[PDB]
PDB file of C-alpha atoms in Angstrom:
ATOM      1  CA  UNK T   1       4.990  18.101 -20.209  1.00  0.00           C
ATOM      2  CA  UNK T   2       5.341  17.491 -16.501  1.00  0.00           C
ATOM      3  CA  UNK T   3       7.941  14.339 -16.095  1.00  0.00           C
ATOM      4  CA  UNK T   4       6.439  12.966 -13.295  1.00  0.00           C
ATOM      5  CA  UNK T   5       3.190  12.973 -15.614  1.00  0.00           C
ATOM      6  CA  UNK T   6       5.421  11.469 -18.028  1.00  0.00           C
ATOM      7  CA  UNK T   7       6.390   9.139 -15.765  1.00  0.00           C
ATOM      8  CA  UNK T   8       3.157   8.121 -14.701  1.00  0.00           C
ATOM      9  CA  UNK T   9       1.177   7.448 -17.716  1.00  0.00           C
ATOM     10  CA  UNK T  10       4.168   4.757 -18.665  1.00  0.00           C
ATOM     11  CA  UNK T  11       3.456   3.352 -15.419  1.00  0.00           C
ATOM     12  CA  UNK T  12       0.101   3.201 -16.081  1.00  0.00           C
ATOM     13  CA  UNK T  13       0.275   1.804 -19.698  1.00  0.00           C
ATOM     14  CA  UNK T  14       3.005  -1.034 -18.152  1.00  0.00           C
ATOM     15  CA  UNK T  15       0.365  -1.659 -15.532  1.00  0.00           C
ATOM     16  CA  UNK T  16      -2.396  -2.402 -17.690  1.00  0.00           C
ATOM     17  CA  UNK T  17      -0.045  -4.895 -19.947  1.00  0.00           C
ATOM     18  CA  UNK T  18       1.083  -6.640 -16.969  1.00  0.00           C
ATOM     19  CA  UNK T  19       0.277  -6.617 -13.397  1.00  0.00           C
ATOM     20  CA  UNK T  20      -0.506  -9.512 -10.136  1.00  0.00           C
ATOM     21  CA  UNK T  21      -3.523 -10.383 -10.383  1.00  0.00           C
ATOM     22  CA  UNK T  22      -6.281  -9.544  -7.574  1.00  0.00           C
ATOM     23  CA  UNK T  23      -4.585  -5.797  -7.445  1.00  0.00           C
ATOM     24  CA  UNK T  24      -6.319  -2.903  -8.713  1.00  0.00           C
ATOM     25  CA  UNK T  25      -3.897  -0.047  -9.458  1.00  0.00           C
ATOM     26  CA  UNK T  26      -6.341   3.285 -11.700  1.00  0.00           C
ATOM     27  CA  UNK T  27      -6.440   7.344 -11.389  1.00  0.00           C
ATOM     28  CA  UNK T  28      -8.693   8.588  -9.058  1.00  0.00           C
ATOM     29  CA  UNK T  29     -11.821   9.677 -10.315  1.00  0.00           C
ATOM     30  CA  UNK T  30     -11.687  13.674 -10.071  1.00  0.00           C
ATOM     31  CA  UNK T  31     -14.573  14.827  -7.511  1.00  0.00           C
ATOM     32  CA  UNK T  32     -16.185  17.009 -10.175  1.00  0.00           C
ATOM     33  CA  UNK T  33     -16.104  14.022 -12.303  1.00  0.00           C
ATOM     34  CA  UNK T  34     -14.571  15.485 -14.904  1.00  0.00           C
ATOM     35  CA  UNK T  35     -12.420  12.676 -15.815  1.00  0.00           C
ATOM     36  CA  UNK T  36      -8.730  11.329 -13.721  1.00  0.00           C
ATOM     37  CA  UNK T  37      -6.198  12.567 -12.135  1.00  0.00           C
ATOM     38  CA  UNK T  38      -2.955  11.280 -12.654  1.00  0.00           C
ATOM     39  CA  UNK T  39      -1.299  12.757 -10.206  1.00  0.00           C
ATOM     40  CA  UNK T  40      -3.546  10.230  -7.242  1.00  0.00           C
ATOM     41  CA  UNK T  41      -4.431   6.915  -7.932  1.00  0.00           C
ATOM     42  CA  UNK T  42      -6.633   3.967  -6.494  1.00  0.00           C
ATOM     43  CA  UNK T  43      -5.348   1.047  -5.575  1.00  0.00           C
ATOM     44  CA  UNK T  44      -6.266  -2.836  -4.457  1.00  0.00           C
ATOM     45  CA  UNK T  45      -4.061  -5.091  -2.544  1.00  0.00           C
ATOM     46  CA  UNK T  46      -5.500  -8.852  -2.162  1.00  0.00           C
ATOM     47  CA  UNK T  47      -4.323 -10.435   1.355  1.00  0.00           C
ATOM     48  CA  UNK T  48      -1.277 -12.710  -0.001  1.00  0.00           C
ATOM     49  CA  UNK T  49      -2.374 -16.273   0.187  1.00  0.00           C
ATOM     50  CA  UNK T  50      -1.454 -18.420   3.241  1.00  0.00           C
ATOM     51  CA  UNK T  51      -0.734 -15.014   5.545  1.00  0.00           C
ATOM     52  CA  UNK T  52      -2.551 -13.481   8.022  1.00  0.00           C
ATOM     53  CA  UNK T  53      -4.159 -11.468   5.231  1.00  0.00           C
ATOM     54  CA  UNK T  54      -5.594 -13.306   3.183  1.00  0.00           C
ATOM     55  CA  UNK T  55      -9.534 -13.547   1.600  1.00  0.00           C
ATOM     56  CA  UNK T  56      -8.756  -9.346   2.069  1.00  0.00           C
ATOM     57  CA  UNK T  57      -8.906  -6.905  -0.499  1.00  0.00           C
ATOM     58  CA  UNK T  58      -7.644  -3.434   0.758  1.00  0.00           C
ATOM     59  CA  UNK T  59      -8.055  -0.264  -1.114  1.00  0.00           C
ATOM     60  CA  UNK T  60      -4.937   2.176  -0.916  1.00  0.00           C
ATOM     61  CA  UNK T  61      -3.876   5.614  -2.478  1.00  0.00           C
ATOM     62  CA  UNK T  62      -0.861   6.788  -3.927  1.00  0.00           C
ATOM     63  CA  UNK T  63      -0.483  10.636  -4.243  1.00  0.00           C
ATOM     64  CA  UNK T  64       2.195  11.845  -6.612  1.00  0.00           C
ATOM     65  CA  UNK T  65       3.990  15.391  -6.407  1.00  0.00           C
ATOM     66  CA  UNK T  66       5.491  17.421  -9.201  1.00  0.00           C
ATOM     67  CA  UNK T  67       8.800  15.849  -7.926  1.00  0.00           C
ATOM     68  CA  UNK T  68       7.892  12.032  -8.672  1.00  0.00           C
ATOM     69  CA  UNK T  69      10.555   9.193  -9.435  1.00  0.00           C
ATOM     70  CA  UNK T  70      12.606  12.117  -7.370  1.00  0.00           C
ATOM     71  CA  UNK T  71      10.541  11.584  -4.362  1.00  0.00           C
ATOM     72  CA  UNK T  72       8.039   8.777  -3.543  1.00  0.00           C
ATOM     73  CA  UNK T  73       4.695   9.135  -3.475  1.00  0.00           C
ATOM     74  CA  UNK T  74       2.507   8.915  -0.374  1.00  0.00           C
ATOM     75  CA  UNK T  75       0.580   5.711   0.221  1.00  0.00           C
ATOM     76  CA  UNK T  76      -2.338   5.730   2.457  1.00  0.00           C
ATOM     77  CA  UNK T  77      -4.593   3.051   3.573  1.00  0.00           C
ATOM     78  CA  UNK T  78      -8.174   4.353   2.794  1.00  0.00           C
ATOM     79  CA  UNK T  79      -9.427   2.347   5.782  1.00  0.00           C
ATOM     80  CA  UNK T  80      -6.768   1.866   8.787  1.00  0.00           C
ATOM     81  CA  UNK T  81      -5.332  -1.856   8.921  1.00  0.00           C
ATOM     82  CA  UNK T  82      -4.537  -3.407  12.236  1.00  0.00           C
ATOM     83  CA  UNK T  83      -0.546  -3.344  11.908  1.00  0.00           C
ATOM     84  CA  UNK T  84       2.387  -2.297  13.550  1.00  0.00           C
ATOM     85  CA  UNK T  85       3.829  -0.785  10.256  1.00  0.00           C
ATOM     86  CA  UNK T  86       0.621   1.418   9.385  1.00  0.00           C
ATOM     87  CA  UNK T  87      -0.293   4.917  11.139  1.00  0.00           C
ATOM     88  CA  UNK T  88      -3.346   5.804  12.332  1.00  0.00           C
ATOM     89  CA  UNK T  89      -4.082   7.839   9.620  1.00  0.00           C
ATOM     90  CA  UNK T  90      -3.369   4.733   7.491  1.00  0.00           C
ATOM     91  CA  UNK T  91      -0.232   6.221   6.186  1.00  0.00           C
ATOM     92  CA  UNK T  92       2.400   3.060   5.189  1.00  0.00           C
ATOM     93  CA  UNK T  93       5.704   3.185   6.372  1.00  0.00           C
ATOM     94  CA  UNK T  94       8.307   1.211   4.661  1.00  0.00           C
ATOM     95  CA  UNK T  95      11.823   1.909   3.529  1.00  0.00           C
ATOM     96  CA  UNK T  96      11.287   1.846   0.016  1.00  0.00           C
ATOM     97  CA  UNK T  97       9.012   4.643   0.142  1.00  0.00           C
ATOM     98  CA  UNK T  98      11.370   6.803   2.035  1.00  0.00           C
ATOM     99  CA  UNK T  99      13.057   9.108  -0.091  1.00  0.00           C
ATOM    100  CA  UNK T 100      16.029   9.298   3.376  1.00  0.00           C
ATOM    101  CA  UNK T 101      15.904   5.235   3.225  1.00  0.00           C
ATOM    102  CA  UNK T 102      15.134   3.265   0.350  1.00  0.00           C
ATOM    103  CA  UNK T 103      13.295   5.017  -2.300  1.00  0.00           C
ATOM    104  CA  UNK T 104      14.796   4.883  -5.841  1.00  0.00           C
ATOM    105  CA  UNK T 105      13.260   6.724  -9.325  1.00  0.00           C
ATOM    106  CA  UNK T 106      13.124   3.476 -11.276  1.00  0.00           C
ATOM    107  CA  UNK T 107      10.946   1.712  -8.308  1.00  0.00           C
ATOM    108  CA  UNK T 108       7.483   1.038  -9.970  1.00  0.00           C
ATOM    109  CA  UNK T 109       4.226   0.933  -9.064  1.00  0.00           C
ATOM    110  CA  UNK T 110       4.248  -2.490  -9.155  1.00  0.00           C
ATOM    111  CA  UNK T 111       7.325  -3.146  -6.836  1.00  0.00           C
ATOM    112  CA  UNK T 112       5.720  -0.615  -4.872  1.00  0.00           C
ATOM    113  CA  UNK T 113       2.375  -2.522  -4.607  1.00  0.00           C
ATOM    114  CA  UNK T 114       3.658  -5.717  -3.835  1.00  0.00           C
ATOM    115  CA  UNK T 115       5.949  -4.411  -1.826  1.00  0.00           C
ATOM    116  CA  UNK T 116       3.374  -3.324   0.499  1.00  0.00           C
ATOM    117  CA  UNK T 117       1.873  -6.648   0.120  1.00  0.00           C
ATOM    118  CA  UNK T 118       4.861  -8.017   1.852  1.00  0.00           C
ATOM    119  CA  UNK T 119       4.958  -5.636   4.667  1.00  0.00           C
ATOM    120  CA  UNK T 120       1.195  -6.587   5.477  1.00  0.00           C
ATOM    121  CA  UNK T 121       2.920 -10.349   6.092  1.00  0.00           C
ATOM    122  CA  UNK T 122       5.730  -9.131   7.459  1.00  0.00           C
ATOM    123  CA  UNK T 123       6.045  -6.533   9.876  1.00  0.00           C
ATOM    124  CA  UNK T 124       8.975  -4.342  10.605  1.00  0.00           C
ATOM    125  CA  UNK T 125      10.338  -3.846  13.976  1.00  0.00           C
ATOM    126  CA  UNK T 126      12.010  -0.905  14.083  1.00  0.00           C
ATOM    127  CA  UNK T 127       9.244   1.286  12.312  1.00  0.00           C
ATOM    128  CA  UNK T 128       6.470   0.954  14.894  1.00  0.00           C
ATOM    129  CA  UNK T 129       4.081   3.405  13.531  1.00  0.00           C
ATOM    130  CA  UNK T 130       0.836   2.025  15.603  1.00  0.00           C
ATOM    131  CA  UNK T 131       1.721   1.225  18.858  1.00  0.00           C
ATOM    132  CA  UNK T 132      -1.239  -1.775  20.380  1.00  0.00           C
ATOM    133  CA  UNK T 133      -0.739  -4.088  16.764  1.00  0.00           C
ATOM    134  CA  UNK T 134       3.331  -3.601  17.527  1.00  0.00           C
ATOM    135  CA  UNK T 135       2.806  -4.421  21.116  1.00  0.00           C
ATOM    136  CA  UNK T 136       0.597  -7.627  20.463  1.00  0.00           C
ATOM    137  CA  UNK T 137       2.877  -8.346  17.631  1.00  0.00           C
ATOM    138  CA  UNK T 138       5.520  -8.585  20.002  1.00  0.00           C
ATOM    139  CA  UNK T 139       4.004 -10.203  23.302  1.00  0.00           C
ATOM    140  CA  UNK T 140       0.817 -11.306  22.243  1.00  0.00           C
ATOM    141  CA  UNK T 141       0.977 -12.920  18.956  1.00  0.00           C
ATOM    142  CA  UNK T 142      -1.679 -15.581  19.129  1.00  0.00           C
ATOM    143  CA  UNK T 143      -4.189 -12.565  19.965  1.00  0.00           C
ATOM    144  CA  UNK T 144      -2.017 -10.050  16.835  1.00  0.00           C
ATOM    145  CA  UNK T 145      -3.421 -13.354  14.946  1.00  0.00           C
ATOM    146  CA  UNK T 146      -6.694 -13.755  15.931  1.00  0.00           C
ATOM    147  CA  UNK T 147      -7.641  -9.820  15.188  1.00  0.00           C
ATOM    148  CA  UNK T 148      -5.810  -9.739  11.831  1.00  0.00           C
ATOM    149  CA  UNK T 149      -7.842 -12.692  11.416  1.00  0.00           C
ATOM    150  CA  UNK T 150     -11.005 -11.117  11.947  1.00  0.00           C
ATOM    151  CA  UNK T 151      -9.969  -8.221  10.176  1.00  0.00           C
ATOM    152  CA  UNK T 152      -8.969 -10.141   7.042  1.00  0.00           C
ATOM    153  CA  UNK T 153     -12.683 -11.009   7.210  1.00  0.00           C
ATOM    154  CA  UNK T 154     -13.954  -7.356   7.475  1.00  0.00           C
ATOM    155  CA  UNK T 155     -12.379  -6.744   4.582  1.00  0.00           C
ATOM    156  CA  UNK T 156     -13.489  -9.152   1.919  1.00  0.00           C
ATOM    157  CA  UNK T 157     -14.913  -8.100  -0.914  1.00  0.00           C
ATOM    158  CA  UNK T 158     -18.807  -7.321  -1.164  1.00  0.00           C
ATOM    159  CA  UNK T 159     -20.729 -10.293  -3.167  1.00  0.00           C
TER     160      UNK T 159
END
């Protein structure tokens, strides 16, 4: 019995009992369909309300290694988000889930989640991992604004 497996069905089970609402936070479905796997989930953020975000939904992963609460997991945006705190390859880059910075085993998927959330509204200077949304950020906010904006938009759910 693997303990980041362990680990992650708690999370899981204290996930479904209580959670924000508007996030979405399930294993990914394996791609022979042949039921979850634990070790990479699917997750929802909503844009938090009054930000720059907001009327957004965007869908994230979280990989897990052998070595989870030991070492974060990875959290990728599965479509790239217009920030100065995101990669390219939609990779988030925050403290908390630096296992040199921030990280800590108890953190949960939660605090992880929201976390994130906050990041989105509030962007971190010294972690520039996309350099034009930085740049704006910095110089140009009215047009940062205006293209979060729009991409807040982009990124509403289908109905």
């Amino acid at each position: 019995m693997s303990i980041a497996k362990k680990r992650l069905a708690q999370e899981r089970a204290e996930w479904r009992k209580d959670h924000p609402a508007g996030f979405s936070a399930k294993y990914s479905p394996m791609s022979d369909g042949k039921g979850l796997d634990i070790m990479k989930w699917i997750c929802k953020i909503p844009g938090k309300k009054g930000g720059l975000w907001e009327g957004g939904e965007y869908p994230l992963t979280m990989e897990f290694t052998e070595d989870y609460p030991s070492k974060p997991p990875k959290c990728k945006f599965t479509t790239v988000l217009f920030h100065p705190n995101i990669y390219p390859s939609g990779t988030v880059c925050l403290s908390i889930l630096n296992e040199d910075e921030d990280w800590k085993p108890s953190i949960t998927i939660k605090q992880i989640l929201l976390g994130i959330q906050d990041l989105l509204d509030n962007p971190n200077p010294n972690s520039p991992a996309q350099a034009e949304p930085f740049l704006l950020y910095q110089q140009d906010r009215d047009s940062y604004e205006k293209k979060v904006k729009k991409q807040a938009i982009e990124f509403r759910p289908k109905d």
